[PDB]
Design a protein around this ligand. Structure first.
Ligand code: HEM
Ligand code: HEM
Ligand code: HEM
Ligand code: HEM
Lengths: 160, 160, 160, 160, 160, 160, 160
């Protein structure tokens, strides 16, 4: 089914946004793992794998609309150099993604592409979910303090 | 453990090579799925997920050597526009990767980084495995013919 | 139990014939596997393992008759360079073996070695079984055609 | 993948070495069985089947490197005429094989064929394992004495 | 079905041969048991029960051919007075039986009694099996020596 | 199999290094247990038992090469007097061991002792694994702080 | 609980005695394994692991009494060069240990350290157990003779 050229552009931009999130979360997972914050690390791994799912879903929609998925580049990565910074960087990436999705979503509605519109409403919904979580974690980070938060998310020497 | 600067460079190049393979295989999976060649598609999905594993393994080694993993860019993608071309493109990517790995591997040996050396020997071994498979598939493609090969790797209308 | 010198000669010739078949079938298995004709390959592997059994059985009979089993040489191998040729080469080897077994069998009867005679009748029976199969496969090969036969005996990319 | 002509030569020589071991072990199994040394016989059968595995593995590597596996001939067989001699003959064959493998292995390294190199390191490792075992058995043979060793490896009249 | 008078004669002679073997094996079982060679004894018991089966099979064939089975007498028994002698006596009895069976077998063939012929081929086959075993045991006896062989086939004081 | 005198020297040095690690880890386990840091203690016990395995493996290789394993002495022990010091002492011991293994490993390669070489590559790989872990733990120790780290690795009064 | 300085000295001497036994038994296990005396070897492995338990128990008591466990040295090792010698060397080590334990035990009683006293009574009891066993084995060794004993404790070629 031939799709609206601009909807395809939006989908490809969202895809690039996702590919960026995937790598950012995965690096954070690895980084957090090496810091000994296993519990924080597992969450990052999960979020990265969630984005992989979004990316796949989007690539399929692009092909169906007869466009060409472009995974050649990523937007700028934001790698935190510490526990709190990674939360900040991930949150920063979510806000940019939500901005982009709300925009794409409005355009899909205007052009009448119902299915593509709902995909963005679904993505918007998932991203607000991550935002909710990160905000709660950042809030808990300040309340507990650097050491306390690290303790809560660290693994004992005899773990796994 | 501080690592040899050039070993880290090689690891980051191998990582970029892998991130490229991951996306190339995934696009091929999606493309093959839309062509109705489900069986060919599932194989591509598997190979893409194998590369994801390699990438993760490499990022961890980089962090351990105290380097910084860089997933900001991918090498040029090779997207086939048909069944046979995708096999060709994937095979082309394997040869470039093997070339790079044999090079990195020699350098690790020369510098004495035993563990990093074996990682490249492991990657070289896996890639020769994929090459073996692709060559057999390309050979089978020419023997069966375009239609015959597509038939062998297609899914009936009542599938899954 | 001391056996008839010539029966032992026949047994050693049959053994050499079998050792030849074992290797011919095994190479064909490997060759067919690399061609992507897995189903054809599995049959060759089975036949090779059947011959291994015959060989073992014959070596035991030779030792019992107090002779010396000689596995130092094989008769000329017939390696096909393609699907149909391998069927032809295997069929060619069966005919030579049957010829030899019918001869040995008559001699065992003449000399009165009942048990050795039945072993050759058993071998003759198994070989006629393989001949039956190969003839049916060759016939099916011509009916289906090169591509069709290869298709029927090929494995999909997502196999095993 | 086209391979180095000399690596293929080495692989075919190793193959010939293995085909030789297979038959030597199998004859020893049969011989030992007729002597009533069932326990010694079962070990020989196992070792013969191990070599069969090595041979298969090597034939596959040869085909992948686009060479032609040659199973037409075997190196000279060494058939012991008694319990201790068979141990000696098998040990003699191991030393020749190890010599050949260490040589092939060095060449693979020099030419940079990593995978083929590791195959020879794997074979070298397995062969040193058999050598270890045989040396321990020969040592135990002299300590126990001909009759004692035969007793330890013999089966009672009511066995199996 | 009225049978050939001479085939019936042969069957009755074979029967007498078997009734003889049954008792010879059973006495040997008992003797060996009293000597404390339980493992040697169990084998003799098994062989005796095998012959019982042969005898039954033969009596049935005789009745079918409308002849009269005669179990009134046995051929001369051969009772060994020691471990090795019993093996010798049993082996001596096998050779006489095989001689008789090969003779009966030829006659059945000449007269065209197919079924009776195969019975003798079956008996010949079983007897060569026992001969094979006994020869291996006698060989093992000389290799191990009187004491060693007795040890291998003896039961500990706390057995069964 | 007679081995290279100097390879045996290296193996015995590696053995001494391992016997040292075994006792150092075990004392640390006991010490940490008495401090109430059960989780830290269990990890030390595991590492000590890992080294026991290495030691056994090395003693076996020495005997095979016909050398004489020498477990009469240990290198200087490094007993920490507190949580962080034990991590430091264990890390210090790993670096010395890696130094020794890389040296032995190069020599095995030079002399062509393939199997012994791989044992050192295996040991080097395991030790880099422990180093990775200890570095992550030391890093986590400074991030959490003395009290926080002790808390994370301590057992409640109602434990086990 | 601060302990009697001399009790701690005795405990550390007993510890050194045990660390010595551990290594002596383990070397004997390995040696016996290479000789092909698997059954004798498994017993040595068990005894070595028993001593490991004693050592651990003693180190814990030392720490509780606020002393410092010293595993830096071992008493002189006694490595037998043959089956019977290893039994002799192990027995020699037991007698020295018992001598030391009876001495430490008396001192603990005199000073009133009840718990430490019972530990030595427990060790004395276990050691007399090993002595009982070794004496029975040495006696059985002379009764059976070198070859007979080796036979009883050897493993067949098809073992494990
Ligand atoms: C940044 C590089 C990537 C890394 C490090 C990575 C890592 C992983 C790993 C190791 C898994 C296996 C499941 C598990 O570990 O629990 C996984 C699964 C998956 N990845 Fe990736 N991945 C990467 C990129 C991608 C991208 C860009 C795509 C394709 C568009 C993708 C799509 C998927 C999907 C859909 C799964 C789920 C598979 C399943 O569980 O059935 N991944 N990835
Ligand atoms: C020289 C004469 C040979 C004899 C008498 C012999 C005997 C045997 C026997 C009795 C089996 C039958 C299956 C079983 O026991 O489970 C076996 C298995 C096997 N043989 Fe042979 N063999 C011979 C040669 C070979 C050759 C030339 C190859 C390949 C180049 C080979 C490779 C194997 C393999 C891979 C198996 C394993 C089957 C499995 O576990 O799936 N054999 N052989
Ligand atoms: C000469 C003295 C014989 C002795 C001491 C003897 C001993 C034995 C023993 C102890 C059994 C009892 C069942 C069992 O153990 O399970 C057995 C089974 C048997 N005997 Fe005999 N037997 C003798 C003669 C015969 C004869 C003359 C025949 C037939 C002509 C014969 C045929 C059989 C058969 C067919 C069985 C198998 C039963 C079954 O498995 O269903 N036996 N015999
Ligand atoms: C001198 C060299 C030593 C060697 C070669 C050695 C060997 C072994 C082996 C192979 C194990 C591994 C686990 C298993 O087999 O299940 C074991 C277990 C054990 N070892 Fe050692 N060991 C040595 C020294 C020690 C020392 C110094 C101690 C303590 C002071 C010790 C205490 C133990 C304990 C308590 C276990 C029992 C594990 C359990 O059952 O939970 N070992 N040792």
């Amino acid at each position: 089914m031939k799709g609206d050229a601009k909807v395809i552009e939006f989908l490809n931009a969202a895809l690039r946004s996702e590919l960026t999130a995937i790598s950012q979360y995965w690096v954070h997972f690895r980084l957090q793992e090496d810091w000994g914050l296993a519990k924080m690390a597992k969450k990052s791994r999960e979020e990265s794998i969630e984005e992989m799912g979004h990316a796949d879903k989007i690539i399929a929609r692009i092909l169906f609309l007869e466009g060409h998925p472009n995974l050649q580049k990523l937007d700028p990565l934001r790698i935190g150099e510490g526990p709190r910074e990674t939360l900040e960087c991930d949150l920063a990436g979510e806000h940019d993604a939500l901005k982009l999705y709300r925009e794409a979503r409005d355009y899909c509605a205007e052009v009448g592409d119902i299915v593509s519109k709902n995909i963005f409403e679904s993505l918007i919904t998932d991203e607000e979910g991550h935002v909710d979580f990160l905000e709660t974690q950042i809030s808990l980070y300040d309340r507990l303090g650097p050491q306390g938060f690290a303790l809560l998310n660290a693994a004992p020497m005899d773990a796994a």
